[PDB]
Ligand binder design. Structure first.
Ligand code: ANP
Ligand code: MG
Ligand code: MG
Length: 302
């Protein structure tokens, strides 16, 4: 919560050094390590360790039980994919505070789904949030971040899907940030820079990395230095998982295939005609199931 001066032991000066260093929220200080904190101007370990321990207090990061376990879960909001069967398989839609992956072969529809989610994010009938754990002012003016890795982002497809949904295409475009990444370094940097958008008043609620693995697969072709690949990709994933937890946003990624973390995993396959099949083969509380949907001029439906 923006007002760092409330942090016992933290004055206006210290606080200044903080907001600069990237800490503007209590949670980010509470979940920080003495290292990443002392790496700032004049912040000693005693001062670093103390505020850190104090931020945890403010946020009440302790042991929870009984009904309190159900409260933490109500903070997770979901987004509709546009498909009824798909949302039912996700028990609502795509979850915030998690990374969900859509893997599949060429033309299976991974990119189409990413575009649709930017459109649905701008319609509150598409957003399913529990009011007991998500105050609507937190969902106000939601913005998306689309890190394009192959250059497949299509402004016209979003406008078309927006028409199909019954809203203004230009509106979706105004509330969507697109960053073209030409390599793994750029992909990773863009993801670390999302914190800057939020510091700039932008309520980033949807982060898309399309695709998550093509650059890594391009820069580490030799299956000898396959360990350096997993290490770099491993850091990228922790950054993504952390920003989904900290800013209560959903993280969406695509993967082309013919291993890395992610809480929900789907296999997408072409079927007859405009039909498609999405199979959930991995999640912590949902069973493996399949969903049939279509891709059309309107976008994703059924
Ligand atoms: N405007 C549109 N109207 C109807 N169908 C469309 C439209 N745009 C794209 N499609 C369909 O979407 C399919 C391709 O979707 P796409 O999301 O790009 O696949 P993909 O998973 O991203 N594969 P890849 O690009 O190799 O990573 C096409 O082959 C079209 O049939
Ligand atoms: Mg999470
Ligand atoms: Mg694609």
């Amino acid at each position: 919560a923006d007002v760092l001066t409330e942090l016992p032991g933290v004055g206006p000066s210290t606080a200044d050094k903080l907001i600069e260093g990237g800490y503007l929220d209590f949670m980010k200080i509470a979940t920080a390590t003495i290292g990443e904190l002392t790496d700032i101007e004049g912040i000693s370990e005693k001062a670093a360790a103390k505020m850190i321990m104090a931020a945890r207090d403010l946020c009440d990061l302790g042991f929870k039980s009984g009904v309190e376990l159900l409260k933490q879960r109500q903070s997770v909001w979901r987004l509709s994919t546009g498909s009824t069967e798909l949302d039912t398989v996700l028990a609502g839609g795509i979850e915030s505070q998690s990374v969900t992956e859509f893997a599949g072969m060429f033309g299976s529809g991974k990119t189409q789904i990413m575009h649709q989610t930017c459109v649905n994010l701008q319609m509150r009938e598409k957003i399913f949030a529990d009011l007991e754990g998500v105050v609507e002012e937190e969902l106000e003016a939601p913005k998306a971040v689309y890190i394009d890795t192959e250059g497949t982002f299509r402004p016209e497809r979003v406008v078309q899907m927006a028409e199909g949904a019954g809203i203004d295409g230009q509106t979706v475009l105004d509330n969507t940030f697109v960053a073209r990444a030409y390599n793994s370094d750029m992909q990773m940097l863009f993801a670390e820079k999302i914190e800057d958008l939020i510091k700039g008043g932008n309520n980033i609620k949807l982060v898309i990395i399309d695709s998550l693995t093509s650059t890594f697969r391009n820069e580490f072709t030799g299956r000898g230095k396959l360990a350096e690949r997993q290490q770099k990709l491993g850091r990228h994933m922790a950054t993504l998982n952390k920003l989904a937890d900290l800013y209560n946003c959903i993280v969406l990624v695509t993967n082309q295939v013919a291993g890395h973390a992610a809480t929900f995993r789907f296999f997408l396959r072409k079927s007859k005609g405009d039909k498609r099949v999405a199979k959930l083969y991995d999640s912590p509380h949902l069973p493996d199931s399949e969903a049939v949907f279509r891709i059309t001029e309107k976008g994703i439906q059924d």
